[PDB]
Design a protein around this motif. Structure first.
Motif, PDB file in Angstrom:
ATOM      1  N   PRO A   1       9.975 -22.236  22.970  1.00  0.00           N
ATOM      2  CA  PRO A   1       9.764 -20.871  23.464  1.00  0.00           C
ATOM      3  C   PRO A   1      10.639 -19.860  22.719  1.00  0.00           C
ATOM      4  O   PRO A   1      11.714 -20.192  22.216  1.00  0.00           O
ATOM      5  CB  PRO A   1      10.137 -20.978  24.942  1.00  0.00           C
ATOM      6  N   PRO A   2      10.185 -18.604  22.651  1.00  0.00           N
ATOM      7  CA  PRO A   2      10.857 -17.484  21.989  1.00  0.00           C
ATOM      8  C   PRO A   2      12.363 -17.348  22.216  1.00  0.00           C
ATOM      9  O   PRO A   2      12.884 -17.605  23.310  1.00  0.00           O
ATOM     10  CB  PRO A   2      10.086 -16.287  22.511  1.00  0.00           C
ATOM     11  N   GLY A   3      13.050 -16.938  21.155  1.00  0.00           N
ATOM     12  CA  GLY A   3      14.483 -16.754  21.219  1.00  0.00           C
ATOM     13  C   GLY A   3      14.815 -15.456  21.925  1.00  0.00           C
ATOM     14  O   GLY A   3      14.112 -14.451  21.773  1.00  0.00           O
ATOM     15  N   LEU A   4      15.895 -15.487  22.698  1.00  0.00           N
ATOM     16  CA  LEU A   4      16.353 -14.327  23.449  1.00  0.00           C
ATOM     17  C   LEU A   4      17.774 -13.943  23.031  1.00  0.00           C
ATOM     18  O   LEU A   4      18.362 -13.008  23.578  1.00  0.00           O
ATOM     19  CB  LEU A   4      16.319 -14.630  24.956  1.00  0.00           C
TER      20      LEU A   4
ATOM     21  N   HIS B   1      14.358 -16.530  16.621  1.00  0.00           N
ATOM     22  CA  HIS B   1      13.320 -17.547  16.769  1.00  0.00           C
ATOM     23  C   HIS B   1      12.084 -16.972  17.461  1.00  0.00           C
ATOM     24  O   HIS B   1      12.138 -16.577  18.624  1.00  0.00           O
ATOM     25  CB  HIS B   1      13.857 -18.734  17.573  1.00  0.00           C
ATOM     26  N   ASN B   2      10.970 -16.928  16.740  1.00  0.00           N
ATOM     27  CA  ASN B   2       9.726 -16.397  17.291  1.00  0.00           C
ATOM     28  C   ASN B   2       8.557 -17.274  16.854  1.00  0.00           C
ATOM     29  O   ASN B   2       7.951 -17.043  15.803  1.00  0.00           O
ATOM     30  CB  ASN B   2       9.508 -14.959  16.812  1.00  0.00           C
ATOM     31  N   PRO B   3       8.222 -18.298  17.661  1.00  0.00           N
ATOM     32  CA  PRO B   3       7.128 -19.239  17.388  1.00  0.00           C
ATOM     33  C   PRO B   3       5.732 -18.616  17.429  1.00  0.00           C
ATOM     34  O   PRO B   3       5.527 -17.575  18.055  1.00  0.00           O
ATOM     35  CB  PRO B   3       7.314 -20.293  18.474  1.00  0.00           C
TER      36      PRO B   3
ATOM     37  N   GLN C   1       2.594 -22.528  21.246  1.00  0.00           N
ATOM     38  CA  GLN C   1       3.357 -23.180  22.317  1.00  0.00           C
ATOM     39  C   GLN C   1       2.617 -24.390  22.912  1.00  0.00           C
ATOM     40  O   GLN C   1       1.387 -24.457  22.905  1.00  0.00           O
ATOM     41  CB  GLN C   1       3.738 -22.155  23.415  1.00  0.00           C
TER      42      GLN C   1
ATOM     43  N   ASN D   1      -2.291 -27.965  32.398  1.00  0.00           N
ATOM     44  CA  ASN D   1      -2.123 -27.276  31.123  1.00  0.00           C
ATOM     45  C   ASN D   1      -2.100 -25.770  31.435  1.00  0.00           C
ATOM     46  O   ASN D   1      -2.474 -24.944  30.610  1.00  0.00           O
ATOM     47  CB  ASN D   1      -3.257 -27.616  30.139  1.00  0.00           C
ATOM     48  N   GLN D   2      -1.633 -25.454  32.645  1.00  0.00           N
ATOM     49  CA  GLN D   2      -1.510 -24.094  33.175  1.00  0.00           C
ATOM     50  C   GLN D   2      -2.843 -23.375  33.306  1.00  0.00           C
ATOM     51  O   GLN D   2      -2.874 -22.214  33.703  1.00  0.00           O
ATOM     52  CB  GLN D   2      -0.558 -23.247  32.312  1.00  0.00           C
ATOM     53  N   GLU D   3      -3.936 -24.069  32.990  1.00  0.00           N
ATOM     54  CA  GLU D   3      -5.290 -23.509  33.028  1.00  0.00           C
ATOM     55  C   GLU D   3      -5.562 -22.493  34.133  1.00  0.00           C
ATOM     56  O   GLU D   3      -6.744 -22.082  34.263  1.00  0.00           O
ATOM     57  CB  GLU D   3      -6.320 -24.639  33.119  1.00  0.00           C
TER      58      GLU D   3
END
Ligand SMILES: O=C(O)c1cncc(-c2cccs2)c1
Ligand SMILES: O=C(O)c1cncc(-c2cccs2)c1
Lengths: 295, 291
Positions: free
Chosen positions: A115-118, A119-121, A124, A293-295
């Motif tokens: 997941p995104p850095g708070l 790195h930007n994929p 997911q 899968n969060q569908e």
């Protein structure tokens, strides 16, 4: 100098060598294009990986490469293992041609999808996706176990991902008895391989399918931490002590208690009490079907 | 990147330019523009069936990056496939000339406009509003089944056709989930972050469940007939409201059940929020039981 095997032999001129891909215990492996790999597909090119020997390679280094190739021929093909596609053994250097996995090893694949850095994929993985990778590796391991092949170094670094996101076990035919291992030798990434070894394989040098199940547990831990590194900052001498005391890594966040119990079972102190890959495939299969899968 | 001088072809989508007549502009963005157009012969067996359609293309000042973003959108649409409640890909002119992406035309504008223009002094009944929501949930369930995460579900991104069918738009839009200017306002002057789930707003974590949260705000928008969420609240104050667990109040002319559905979508725990599959099932039951 080497015997001809018309089963796997591909003419050297049918292979176009490309850029390197090794420098990671995998030896010097390069990407290539094979023309007419299949008898019915003479005009089609397939991207493949090619293993070969270095400049200063002893007659022994050659011995090990040949055995790895023989091993692969005996083991046979499976969807979840890096498969043998052919070989160039006549009139020139030895070339062992195997399946190419364009998305690299599992460790990198997972880290790049964090997941995104708070790195930007740019992509997911859902929870179902993660359990699914676990399932495929177990499937490949079950097949290998069924062929009496003991891996000895099961870890995400040795699982590769194809362009279609299929997990493939690699280095399963690697030359054995090299167990004169240097416990202090680091991986190309800087991690100590001893961290994936069952206590009996580590202390009594005993390797079995049960010790491979212990490694698979560590691998499960790697999958759920998105490529986490086990025991970070822990040196070999301290690892021995942690194991002697029965320490077990903690539960990853975003990991159901069931999956964590599965890991703990793989880490049973008694080898015979650990599940088998056959059991793991079945459990993981059921869990995959139930994971969202969060569908 | 070969698209610099020529684009790859796809015969099962390509449409001859002579069979497309560009017309009145429909919208304008930073990347490109959309114009109204009549396509002559979109459908097979009907080489004279003029269809009103919308055409996406780049503006004169576009760069290579904009072109690749429009191509990605088009590809994503091919991969996602067709569904009644989403704006569908109908064709494209990719050769010899500017890239034209032909999609479905919705003559009644976006949902916000559609609801505002019909507020009771043909207006909408309670069943209709619930019907709108159901349609949107259905479109989202399809997208989610195709692994598509919208990231900006709002009434402004739902279009309405002549037959009053709801269609999710901008779902295949290539967006950079980092370069998000929370202060950047919509054409209508509102702040997009007001539709954003807390985990996506604070951790840039976008899931199908973060879209569910947006869906809840869209539900509120439907039952307020195009009302504006958090009017006058700037970005900094919005963050503070979210941290406090603040939740918009129940709209008037809205059942306790539909309000619980919104509050459920606004669960702090994403896994506790319903999925679009469950929303479609509940809304189906609710629509039936609505006057
Ligand atoms: O390193 C890669 O990207 C890569 C990709 N595909 C295959 C391999 C290997 C297969 C068998 C030994 S290495 C390696
Ligand atoms: O503005 C309209 O009325 C309208 C109507 N139909 C489609 C659009 C689209 C714009 C971009 C993708 S579809 C816009």
């Amino acid at each position: 100098e080497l015997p001809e095997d018309p089963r796997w032999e591909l003419p050297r001129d049918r292979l176009v060598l490309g850029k390197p891909l090794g420098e990671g215990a995998f030896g010097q492996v390069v990407l290539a294009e094979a023309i007419g790999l299949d008898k019915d597909k003479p005009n089609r090119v397939t991207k493949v990986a090619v293993k070969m020997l270095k400049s200063d390679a002893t007659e022994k280094d050659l011995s090990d490469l040949i055995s790895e190739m023989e091993m692969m021929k005996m083991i046979g093909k499976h969807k979840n293992i890096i498969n043998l596609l052919g070989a160039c053994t006549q009139d020139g250097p030895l070339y062992v041609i195997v399946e190419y996995a364009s998305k690299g090893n599992l460790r990198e694949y997972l880290q790049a999808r964090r997941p995104p850095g708070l790195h930007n994929p740019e992509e997911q993985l859902s929870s179902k996706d993660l359990v699914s990778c676990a399932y495929q590796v177990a499937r490949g391991m079950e097949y290998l176990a069924s062929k009496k092949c003991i891996h000895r170094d099961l870890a995400a670094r040795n699982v590769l991902v194809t362009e279609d996101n299929v997990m493939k076990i690699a280095d399963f035919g690697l030359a054995r008895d090299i167990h004169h291992i240097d416990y202090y030798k680091k991986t190309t990434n800087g991690r100590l391989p001893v961290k994936w070894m069952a206590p009996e394989a580590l202390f009594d040098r005993i390797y079995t399918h049960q010790s491979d199940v212990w490694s698979f547990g560590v691998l499960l831990w790697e999958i759920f931490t998105l490529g986490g590194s086990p025991y970070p900052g822990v040196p070999v001498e301290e690892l021995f002590k942690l194991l002697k005391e029965g320490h077990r890594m903690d539960k990853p966040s975003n990991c159901t208690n069931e999956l964590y119990m599965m890991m703990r079972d793989c880490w049973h102190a008694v080898p015979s009490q650990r599940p088998t890959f056959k059991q793991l495939v079945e459990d993981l299969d059921r869990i995959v079907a139930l994971t969202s899968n969060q569908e």
